[PDB]
Amino acid sequence: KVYSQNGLVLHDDANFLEHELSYIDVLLDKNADQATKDNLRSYFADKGLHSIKDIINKAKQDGFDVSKY
Amino acid sequence: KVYSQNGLVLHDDANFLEHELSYIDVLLDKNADQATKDNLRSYFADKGLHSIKDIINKAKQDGFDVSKYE
Amino acid sequence: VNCETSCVQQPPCFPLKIPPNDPRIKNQADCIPFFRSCPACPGSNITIRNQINALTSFVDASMVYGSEEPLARNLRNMSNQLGLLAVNQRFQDNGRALLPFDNLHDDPCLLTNRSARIPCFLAGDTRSSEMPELTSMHTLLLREHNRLATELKSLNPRWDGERLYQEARKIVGAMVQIITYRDYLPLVLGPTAMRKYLPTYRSYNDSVDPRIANVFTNAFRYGHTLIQPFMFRLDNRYQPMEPNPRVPLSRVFFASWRVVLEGGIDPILRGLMATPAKLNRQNQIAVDEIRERLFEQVMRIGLDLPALNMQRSRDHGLPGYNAWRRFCGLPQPETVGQLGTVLRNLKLARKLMEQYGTPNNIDIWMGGVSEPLKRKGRVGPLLACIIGTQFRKLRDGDRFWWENEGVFSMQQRQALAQISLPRIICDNTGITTVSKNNIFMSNSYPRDFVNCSTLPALNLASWRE
Amino acid sequence: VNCETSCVQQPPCFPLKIPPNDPRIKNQADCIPFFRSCPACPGSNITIRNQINALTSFVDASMVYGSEEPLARNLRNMSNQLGLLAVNQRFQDNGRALLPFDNLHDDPCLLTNRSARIPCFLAGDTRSSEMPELTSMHTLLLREHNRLATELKSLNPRWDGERLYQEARKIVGAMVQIITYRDYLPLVLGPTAMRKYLPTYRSYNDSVDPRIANVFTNAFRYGHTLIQPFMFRLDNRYQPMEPNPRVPLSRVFFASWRVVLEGGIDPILRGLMATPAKLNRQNQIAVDEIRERLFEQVMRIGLDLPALNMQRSRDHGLPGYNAWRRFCGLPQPETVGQLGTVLRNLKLARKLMEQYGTPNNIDIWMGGVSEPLKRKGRVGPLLACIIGTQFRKLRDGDRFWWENEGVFSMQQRQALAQISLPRIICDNTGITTVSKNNIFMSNSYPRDFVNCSTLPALNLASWRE
Amino acid sequence: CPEQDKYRTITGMCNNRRSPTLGASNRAFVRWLPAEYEDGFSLPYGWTPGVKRNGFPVALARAVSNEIVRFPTDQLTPDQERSLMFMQWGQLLDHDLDFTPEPAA
Amino acid sequence: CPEQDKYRTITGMCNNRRSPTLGASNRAFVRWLPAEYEDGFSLPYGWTPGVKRNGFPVALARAVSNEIVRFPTDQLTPDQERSLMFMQWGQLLDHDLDFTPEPAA
Ligand SMILES: *[C@@H]1O[C@H](CO[C@@H]2O[C@@H](C)[C@@H](O)[C@@H](O)[C@@H]2O)[C@@H](O[C@@H]2O[C@H](CO)[C@@H](O[C@@H]3O[C@H](CO[C@H]4O[C@H](CO)[C@@H](O)[C@H](O)[C@@H]4O)[C@@H](O)[C@H](O[C@H]4O[C@H](CO)[C@@H](O)[C@H](O)[C@@H]4O)[C@@H]3O)[C@H](O)[C@H]2NC(C)=O)[C@H](O)[C@H]1NC(C)=O
Ligand SMILES: *[C@@H]1O[C@H](CO[C@@H]2O[C@@H](C)[C@@H](O)[C@@H](O)[C@@H]2O)[C@@H](O[C@@H]2O[C@H](CO)[C@@H](O[C@@H]3O[C@H](CO[C@H]4O[C@H](CO)[C@@H](O)[C@H](O)[C@@H]4O)[C@@H](O)[C@H](O[C@H]4O[C@H](CO)[C@@H](O)[C@H](O)[C@@H]4O)[C@@H]3O)[C@H](O)[C@H]2NC(C)=O)[C@H](O)[C@H]1NC(C)=O
Ligand code: HEM
Ligand code: HEM
Ligand SMILES: *[C@@H]1O[C@H](CO)[C@@H](O[C@@H]2O[C@H](CO)[C@@H](O)[C@H](O)[C@H]2NC(C)=O)[C@H](O)[C@H]1NC(C)=O
Ligand SMILES: *[C@@H]1O[C@H](CO)[C@@H](O)[C@H](O)[C@H]1NC(C)=O
Ligand SMILES: *[C@@H]1O[C@H](CO)[C@@H](O)[C@H](O)[C@H]1NC(C)=O
Ligand SMILES: *[C@@H]1O[C@H](CO)[C@@H](O)[C@H](O)[C@H]1NC(C)=O
Ligand SMILES: [Br-]
Ligand SMILES: [Br-]
Ligand SMILES: [Br-]
Ligand SMILES: [Br-]
Ligand SMILES: [Br-]
Ligand SMILES: [Br-]
Ligand SMILES: [Br-]
Ligand SMILES: [Br-]
Ligand SMILES: [Br-]
Ligand SMILES: [Br-]
Ligand SMILES: [Br-]
Ligand SMILES: [Br-]
Ligand SMILES: [Br-]
Ligand SMILES: [Br-]
Ligand SMILES: [Br-]
Ligand SMILES: [Br-]
Ligand SMILES: [Br-]
Ligand SMILES: [Br-]
Ligand SMILES: [Br-]
Ligand SMILES: [Br-]
Ligand SMILES: [Br-]
Ligand SMILES: [Br-]
Ligand SMILES: [Br-]
Ligand SMILES: [Br-]
Ligand SMILES: [Br-]
Ligand SMILES: [Br-]
Ligand SMILES: [Br-]
Ligand SMILES: [Br-]
Ligand SMILES: [Br-]
Ligand SMILES: [Br-]
Ligand SMILES: [Br-]
Ligand SMILES: [Br-]
Ligand SMILES: [Br-]
Ligand SMILES: [Br-]
Ligand SMILES: [Br-]
Ligand SMILES: [Br-]
Ligand SMILES: [Br-]
Ligand SMILES: [Br-]
Ligand SMILES: [Br-]
Ligand SMILES: [Br-]
Ligand SMILES: [Br-]
Ligand SMILES: [Br-]
Ligand SMILES: [Br-]
Ligand SMILES: [Br-]
Ligand SMILES: [Br-]
Ligand SMILES: [Br-]
Ligand SMILES: [Br-]
Ligand SMILES: [Br-]
Ligand SMILES: [Br-]
Ligand SMILES: [Br-]
Ligand SMILES: [Br-]
Ligand SMILES: [Br-]
Ligand SMILES: [Br-]
Ligand SMILES: [Br-]
Ligand SMILES: [Br-]
Ligand SMILES: [Br-]
Ligand SMILES: [Ca+2]
Ligand SMILES: [Ca+2]
């Protein structure tokens, strides 16, 4: 949800978070163990993002630079 | 308001009441004082009935005999 | 889903399911109809659901005058300036007034004696026809209002209709307060609890919350254990009246025709004064006229008033017996042994634990009415706490309480203290022989009866202006 | 009508109007922005309006972990099984973690130092960036979680991430409970009130309602009287740090850039330990950095936090001073004389009566903070009652209270009793010199300081499995 | 609320001048205890098959009536010291205090 | 609520097993006293021009701040017996206890 105080939006869960970009790196790391990636895919699928194209695309829409992907 | 208890309608204010018929007779009584009638016209107009034709016609829709005004 | 004609559990229906070996309802795919009470905040997934009181909490005789401005006007005689309540225009009771008829499109009173074609009555509360004994009480108070207004007009001729109505209403309201708090409640709670929950009145306290608590709607149904299986009627010798002296209750629900055609309110009031109430006992809680045949004349199936009681407390999300015990400062039994001690009845305890598994889950009404009664009261300590606490709030939190400074003059208070229900009956009916104080304890004719002449009338001289 | 830019009174805006001769706002057609709190049941003309708490009332460290399952997950490091909270991926504080950045479309932190381009932080509560002192406390607890999880993984290697997270969280939660109830609240209430409102813990009581009362949201704002007009920062000699040692508060609201680029959390925490709080005095209630310049860098006009407090109490429909006094069993002054006696200050009484006309109308925060302070406490009797009662409820009504049987082992309880905020600071920062017990009273360097070496760490040996 | 009045309002409004809905009609009941519902906030116990209350099955209300409340009517005990008017005043009084509305058909 | 659990829920649900929303997030505050609104049920005092509370004008909150709360900052009185950490723990703690939401624009 959107948490609001004195007309200032203080958090919105709708938005991709910068620290979740480091999760994109783990998914593309070829030498990272398959259980770690499955857990992350499940994390991003609980949020309604099912492919890495859907993940990267949501980060971009939310204002992040994703040009190294 | 419709007041309801155990699937039984116990009162509905929408409906004309039998005792209000006796008010129709006071309005048609030619020798009844004009202050009394004004009070009643206001009572029936607060309910959204503005003429005696509209009053009698509402009593009819709500199941009463109004043939004795013919 | 029409909750009356379907057994599907879908909002707003919460039908009572039928156990395997039911004495009356053979088919387990049948149900007892039940509509969930209206929620205060419909559709919310934030609020904790709560229900609505349609009436004024105050003991203000709103059962006579109504709790909403359209009904309140509609109850009044608008054809003159005498400040009267409206009366029936088709029927009279040996010359005295009857309630006006209400107009419902599906009228349950018409379904009792089909041929008699006598509809339900209209009063300040919508339930006035539910049993004719109740109707008679409403009718009595209707007449008392009009008698007062008439006496006041005579006394103060320059008073307009609005003034007469209010003053009479204010008197009738005090009479209900006095009868309730002086005569009725001491016999509900017993002396110990009366002194604990209702100590002597001091003065209006604007910080006392006067609202009805949700639990009180269920707890005050203790009265269901007082109900006899018949309506008793008595002639002017206080003998049984021969057009059916003892009608079964399942033939009097909504039976407004009985008032109009079977001899008016006099026989019914005699019946109430001179017949004993039922006693609540642990093995004789409530009768089958309400447990098997509630409303059976006006409905597809007879209801079970006790069971409705219990379904309703769950509808209202009421905590169980031990939580209310704790609320009241009473010990909370955990084992069947301890519950046996609390009930002075191990057998009943075992039966309660078999139904509920823990005393924590016992529905408030069932636990309440199971408790042994306080000395000289007709509730146990749990119900006495809830009911006591409620009426304290209604008294101390009422700005118009009759004893509150400025509501009445000292002279008017002195005169109001002479009122009694027996006197009101003498003033407004053809009864000339009535119970001794206390009307609610007196129950045997003629041992407990006196002539109307012996009772002091209400003197309205201090209302002169 | 956008309540942030508009002075029209239309739901949901309740802008504070400007008095004729205002010292700061010359223009009386302007206003202070105010949005009415979200109602529980929007648009109802049956319910009495009430507001919503978006957080768990329990002292469960929900400011760290969140109060809702999407945020709570989003705060976790989901790239491994170590049970860690997520940390900043761009910045570190001399090698230690910072809170992750939140992503807001309209981010107020970016409006403080425009050129620094540092957004607000993400934490269990959404207000974490409001002042950098608060941010530092959030950051500290972030690190303490991850330190615990790390130590626990070492001790119990076969524990998965879910398990590590829960156990660390459970420890952090108890640490907040202990610091709050053992160290903080006694200094809030003073000993008399502590013994009255928070007697010795017995056990979990499942009948105690642990909700936050509406009035507590206003009453606990007593802390606004403690606020100093500057943020103080100190180097490792506890001397002023030369990139601005004493920043005015109106230049630190949402100033997350100060934490990331002006030397991390160490200087800020030193500042908090080695600087006094402001004393509440009846003539020196709250400073102009919050009374005139609240949030002025991120918003069209500086707010007035005291005034907001008072508008908010009316938004929430809170009764006035005398009603809360009565609730607490405290005398209720009616005259200016009596109010003077209660406040031990006739002058202030006169000023309050000139504003409000009766003590019945004094807004709860204003009356609360006006009261003379209890001995060795920082609130008067009224606020001590409300705040005391609140924390009693939160303790006795919390099934996971740290001392409740079954929550921790006896050994774990023994070890938890060694924890203190000073030690937590030693464990998670570059600070090697910290306050003596009690951290909240100790305030002067070096008189009141000790080396980290002297303090016992939390022993996790009884968490082995 | 008017500053001065002589009689009760019909609705009960303004009886309590500081909180003038208190005791008035068409308002929620007050709660003396927190409500206890199946789901925490609206569904009654008994609603969902198989869902217990505090670890025990919810008893059919009709079962409780059958097993505990039922008795043979010929065994009814008249109260020596209470009249049937005592029953009836309770119902009349209840009807001054509370009416809990339900949806119609 | 599960019959047996080892850790707190995030939301606070099920802390109290009999009434499991108690202390959980996104629920109404409890009221220790009846609310006091201009109209009985939703409008705050100060809303309607010229409407008094208990017989007296409502004081502008900013006026009350100006006249009672304002003081010269250079005269600030340090607390000899409390650190600024005492202030800051209070705010952190408040942020464990309550957050009252408002509509966004
Ligand atoms: C577990 O906690 C329960 C709740 O505890 C409250 O909060 C905790 C944190 C403590 O601060 C505690 O002191 C608090 O009470 C606790 O249950 C409570 O127990 C008390 C005492 O038994 C109950 O009070 C009694 O209430 C009844 C009913 O009236 C009350 O409610 C109405 C309506 O809200 C109000 O209008 C009243 O003013 C009351 O508040 C009273 O009839 C009764 O008083 C009468 O009798 C006593 C003694 O003879 C006289 O002194 C009085 O003058 C009266 O004549 C009490 O006031 C309380 O209702 C109840 N709360 C709940 C939620 O059940 C429980 O005992 C704790 N258990 C353990 C093992 O610790
Ligand atoms: C006018 O009526 C007011 C309402 O009174 C109640 O209703 C009437 C009908 C009677 O039944 C009456 O006896 C009822 O109490 C009345 O004000 C009430 O005053 C009492 C006593 O002062 C107040 O009780 C105190 O409450 C505080 C706060 O805690 C309460 O609330 C929380 C949550 O609701 C609960 O958790 C608690 O259990 C409490 O109920 C307590 O701090 C305090 O107890 C402590 O202090 C006393 C005094 O030193 C000690 O003896 C105790 O052991 C405790 O340490 C009391 O329980 C009550 O809040 C207040 N209510 C209102 C609505 O203001 C008022 O005094 C009446 N005036 C006159 C002149 O008659
Ligand atoms: C002739 C005597 C009585 C009835 C017939 C009768 C019937 C009902 C019914 C049908 C209900 C509703 C049941 C449901 O929950 O669906 C009901 C509720 C209440 N009662 Fe009953 N009752 C008769 C007699 C009494 C007596 C003597 C009472 C008290 C002394 C009494 C009380 C009440 C109350 C307070 C309710 C709840 C009302 C509400 O809507 O708030 N009744 N009764
Ligand atoms: C640096 C310290 C503090 C602030 C900056 C600050 C600011 C606020 C603001 C803006 C509000 C909202 C006001 C409104 O009604 O519009 C607010 C409310 C609350 N506070 Fe404040 N606060 C600072 C510091 C403290 C301290 C030290 C407190 C207590 C010891 C404290 C308490 C509170 C509380 C409880 C609230 C209400 C929270 C809610 O939303 O329920 N604050 N504060
Ligand atoms: C705004 O933020 C910038 C950082 O982006 C601050 O500039 C730094 O100031 C320090 C101390 O004066 C210097 O040592 C740095 O080298 C500066 N960095 C840059 C990139 O300029 C600036 O001082 C801040 N402004 C305010 C209002 O204090
Ligand atoms: C009104 O009162 C008059 C005189 O008492 C009576 O004749 C008339 O029938 C009454 N009407 C109603 C509807 O009560
Ligand atoms: C029905 O009412 C009539 C009067 O209309 C009466 O004579 C008859 O006996 C009544 N029937 C019953 C079932 O009592
Ligand atoms: C998770 O933890 C690993 C190991 O400590 C760390 O390298 C990484 O930055 C962390 N991820 C996040 C987003 O916190
Ligand atoms: Br009629
Ligand atoms: Br429903
Ligand atoms: Br609620
Ligand atoms: Br008559
Ligand atoms: Br029949
Ligand atoms: Br009924
Ligand atoms: Br009396
Ligand atoms: Br008595
Ligand atoms: Br009260
Ligand atoms: Br038995
Ligand atoms: Br029977
Ligand atoms: Br319980
Ligand atoms: Br007796
Ligand atoms: Br007896
Ligand atoms: Br007893
Ligand atoms: Br007197
Ligand atoms: Br007779
Ligand atoms: Br009598
Ligand atoms: Br505009
Ligand atoms: Br709004
Ligand atoms: Br002004
Ligand atoms: Br200006
Ligand atoms: Br409400
Ligand atoms: Br770290
Ligand atoms: Br800056
Ligand atoms: Br804040
Ligand atoms: Br786990
Ligand atoms: Br502790
Ligand atoms: Br102490
Ligand atoms: Br104290
Ligand atoms: Br409680
Ligand atoms: Br440093
Ligand atoms: Br700056
Ligand atoms: Br300042
Ligand atoms: Br702005
Ligand atoms: Br007051
Ligand atoms: Br005083
Ligand atoms: Br002075
Ligand atoms: Br002063
Ligand atoms: Br001290
Ligand atoms: Br001190
Ligand atoms: Br105190
Ligand atoms: Br250091
Ligand atoms: Br130390
Ligand atoms: Br310490
Ligand atoms: Br060390
Ligand atoms: Br109202
Ligand atoms: Br309740
Ligand atoms: Br509730
Ligand atoms: Br509640
Ligand atoms: Br089950
Ligand atoms: Br969870
Ligand atoms: Br409150
Ligand atoms: Br309220
Ligand atoms: Br309330
Ligand atoms: Br000044
Ligand atoms: Ca009433
Ligand atoms: Ca919390």
PDB file of N, CA, C and O in Angstrom, chain D residues 58-61 172-183 394-395 398 400-403 408, chain F residues 8 89 96:
ATOM      1  N   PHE D  58       1.905  -4.169  19.645  1.00  0.00           N
ATOM      2  CA  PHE D  58       2.890  -4.827  20.494  1.00  0.00           C
ATOM      3  C   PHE D  58       4.255  -4.188  20.282  1.00  0.00           C
ATOM      4  O   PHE D  58       4.546  -3.671  19.207  1.00  0.00           O
ATOM      5  N   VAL D  59       5.060  -4.282  21.334  1.00  0.00           N
ATOM      6  CA  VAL D  59       6.456  -3.918  21.321  1.00  0.00           C
ATOM      7  C   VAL D  59       7.224  -5.124  20.791  1.00  0.00           C
ATOM      8  O   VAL D  59       7.744  -5.938  21.542  1.00  0.00           O
ATOM      9  N   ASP D  60       7.244  -5.226  19.470  1.00  0.00           N
ATOM     10  CA  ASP D  60       7.698  -6.392  18.724  1.00  0.00           C
ATOM     11  C   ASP D  60       8.746  -5.976  17.703  1.00  0.00           C
ATOM     12  O   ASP D  60       9.067  -6.731  16.795  1.00  0.00           O
ATOM     13  N   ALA D  61       9.249  -4.751  17.855  1.00  0.00           N
ATOM     14  CA  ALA D  61      10.224  -4.213  16.940  1.00  0.00           C
ATOM     15  C   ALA D  61       9.691  -4.204  15.518  1.00  0.00           C
ATOM     16  O   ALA D  61      10.452  -4.400  14.590  1.00  0.00           O
ATOM     17  N   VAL D 172      15.819  -9.460  19.008  1.00  0.00           N
ATOM     18  CA  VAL D 172      15.754  -8.018  18.856  1.00  0.00           C
ATOM     19  C   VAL D 172      14.486  -7.464  19.503  1.00  0.00           C
ATOM     20  O   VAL D 172      14.480  -6.359  20.060  1.00  0.00           O
ATOM     21  N   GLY D 173      13.413  -8.237  19.460  1.00  0.00           N
ATOM     22  CA  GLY D 173      12.136  -7.784  19.975  1.00  0.00           C
ATOM     23  C   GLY D 173      12.166  -7.694  21.482  1.00  0.00           C
ATOM     24  O   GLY D 173      11.627  -6.761  22.048  1.00  0.00           O
ATOM     25  N   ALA D 174      12.771  -8.692  22.120  1.00  0.00           N
ATOM     26  CA  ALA D 174      12.939  -8.692  23.561  1.00  0.00           C
ATOM     27  C   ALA D 174      13.865  -7.563  23.990  1.00  0.00           C
ATOM     28  O   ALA D 174      13.697  -7.035  25.067  1.00  0.00           O
ATOM     29  N   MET D 175      14.874  -7.240  23.187  1.00  0.00           N
ATOM     30  CA  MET D 175      15.829  -6.194  23.539  1.00  0.00           C
ATOM     31  C   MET D 175      15.119  -4.848  23.602  1.00  0.00           C
ATOM     32  O   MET D 175      15.408  -4.034  24.470  1.00  0.00           O
ATOM     33  N   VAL D 176      14.184  -4.633  22.677  1.00  0.00           N
ATOM     34  CA  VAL D 176      13.369  -3.438  22.677  1.00  0.00           C
ATOM     35  C   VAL D 176      12.454  -3.419  23.906  1.00  0.00           C
ATOM     36  O   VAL D 176      12.264  -2.375  24.521  1.00  0.00           O
ATOM     37  N   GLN D 177      11.944  -4.579  24.308  1.00  0.00           N
ATOM     38  CA  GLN D 177      11.066  -4.663  25.464  1.00  0.00           C
ATOM     39  C   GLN D 177      11.825  -4.324  26.733  1.00  0.00           C
ATOM     40  O   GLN D 177      11.385  -3.512  27.543  1.00  0.00           O
ATOM     41  N   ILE D 178      12.984  -4.952  26.885  1.00  0.00           N
ATOM     42  CA  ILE D 178      13.798  -4.749  28.071  1.00  0.00           C
ATOM     43  C   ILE D 178      14.249  -3.291  28.172  1.00  0.00           C
ATOM     44  O   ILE D 178      14.061  -2.661  29.212  1.00  0.00           O
ATOM     45  N   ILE D 179      14.811  -2.739  27.087  1.00  0.00           N
ATOM     46  CA  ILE D 179      15.278  -1.364  27.140  1.00  0.00           C
ATOM     47  C   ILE D 179      14.116  -0.442  27.473  1.00  0.00           C
ATOM     48  O   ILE D 179      14.278   0.456  28.291  1.00  0.00           O
ATOM     49  N   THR D 180      12.959  -0.680  26.865  1.00  0.00           N
ATOM     50  CA  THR D 180      11.797   0.168  27.062  1.00  0.00           C
ATOM     51  C   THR D 180      11.330   0.126  28.506  1.00  0.00           C
ATOM     52  O   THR D 180      11.049   1.173  29.080  1.00  0.00           O
ATOM     53  N   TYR D 181      11.166  -1.070  29.061  1.00  0.00           N
ATOM     54  CA  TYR D 181      10.426  -1.209  30.316  1.00  0.00           C
ATOM     55  C   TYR D 181      11.365  -1.085  31.515  1.00  0.00           C
ATOM     56  O   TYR D 181      10.949  -0.639  32.585  1.00  0.00           O
ATOM     57  N   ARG D 182      12.621  -1.524  31.356  1.00  0.00           N
ATOM     58  CA  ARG D 182      13.569  -1.481  32.450  1.00  0.00           C
ATOM     59  C   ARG D 182      14.252  -0.112  32.499  1.00  0.00           C
ATOM     60  O   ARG D 182      14.492   0.375  33.592  1.00  0.00           O
ATOM     61  N   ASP D 183      14.578   0.490  31.347  1.00  0.00           N
ATOM     62  CA  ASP D 183      15.457   1.662  31.311  1.00  0.00           C
ATOM     63  C   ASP D 183      14.710   2.963  30.946  1.00  0.00           C
ATOM     64  O   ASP D 183      14.942   4.018  31.531  1.00  0.00           O
ATOM     65  N   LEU D 394       0.103  -3.272  26.964  1.00  0.00           N
ATOM     66  CA  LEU D 394       0.966  -3.829  25.935  1.00  0.00           C
ATOM     67  C   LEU D 394       1.814  -4.960  26.485  1.00  0.00           C
ATOM     68  O   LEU D 394       2.311  -5.798  25.733  1.00  0.00           O
ATOM     69  N   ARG D 395       2.029  -4.934  27.789  1.00  0.00           N
ATOM     70  CA  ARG D 395       2.892  -5.908  28.425  1.00  0.00           C
ATOM     71  C   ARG D 395       2.061  -7.126  28.812  1.00  0.00           C
ATOM     72  O   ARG D 395       2.349  -8.208  28.338  1.00  0.00           O
ATOM     73  N   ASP D 398       0.422  -9.267  25.912  1.00  0.00           N
ATOM     74  CA  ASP D 398       1.319  -9.729  24.868  1.00  0.00           C
ATOM     75  C   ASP D 398       1.750 -11.163  25.156  1.00  0.00           C
ATOM     76  O   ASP D 398       2.487 -11.398  26.106  1.00  0.00           O
ATOM     77  N   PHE D 400       3.685 -12.977  23.606  1.00  0.00           N
ATOM     78  CA  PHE D 400       5.093 -13.184  23.305  1.00  0.00           C
ATOM     79  C   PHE D 400       5.996 -12.267  24.123  1.00  0.00           C
ATOM     80  O   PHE D 400       7.174 -12.176  23.823  1.00  0.00           O
ATOM     81  N   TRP D 401       5.456 -11.640  25.172  1.00  0.00           N
ATOM     82  CA  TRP D 401       6.261 -10.882  26.114  1.00  0.00           C
ATOM     83  C   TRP D 401       7.454 -11.729  26.531  1.00  0.00           C
ATOM     84  O   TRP D 401       7.322 -12.935  26.697  1.00  0.00           O
ATOM     85  N   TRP D 402       8.625 -11.103  26.680  1.00  0.00           N
ATOM     86  CA  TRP D 402       9.846 -11.884  26.790  1.00  0.00           C
ATOM     87  C   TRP D 402       9.893 -12.696  28.083  1.00  0.00           C
ATOM     88  O   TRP D 402      10.516 -13.747  28.104  1.00  0.00           O
ATOM     89  N   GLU D 403       9.239 -12.221  29.150  1.00  0.00           N
ATOM     90  CA  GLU D 403       9.248 -12.949  30.417  1.00  0.00           C
ATOM     91  C   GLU D 403       8.088 -13.939  30.521  1.00  0.00           C
ATOM     92  O   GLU D 403       7.963 -14.620  31.524  1.00  0.00           O
ATOM     93  N   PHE D 408      10.848 -17.845  26.193  1.00  0.00           N
ATOM     94  CA  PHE D 408      12.269 -18.130  26.247  1.00  0.00           C
ATOM     95  C   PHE D 408      12.506 -19.156  27.353  1.00  0.00           C
ATOM     96  O   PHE D 408      11.665 -19.381  28.216  1.00  0.00           O
TER      97      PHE D 408
ATOM     98  N   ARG F   8       5.884 -14.810  16.605  1.00  0.00           N
ATOM     99  CA  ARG F   8       4.915 -13.785  16.275  1.00  0.00           C
ATOM    100  C   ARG F   8       4.632 -13.772  14.774  1.00  0.00           C
ATOM    101  O   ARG F   8       5.528 -13.993  13.963  1.00  0.00           O
ATOM    102  N   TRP F  89      14.791   7.576  21.728  1.00  0.00           N
ATOM    103  CA  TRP F  89      14.168   6.300  22.004  1.00  0.00           C
ATOM    104  C   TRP F  89      12.640   6.417  22.007  1.00  0.00           C
ATOM    105  O   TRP F  89      11.933   5.531  21.514  1.00  0.00           O
ATOM    106  N   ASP F  96       7.119   1.856  16.766  1.00  0.00           N
ATOM    107  CA  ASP F  96       6.781   0.463  16.973  1.00  0.00           C
ATOM    108  C   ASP F  96       5.296   0.327  17.329  1.00  0.00           C
ATOM    109  O   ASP F  96       4.727  -0.747  17.209  1.00  0.00           O
TER     110      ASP F  96
END
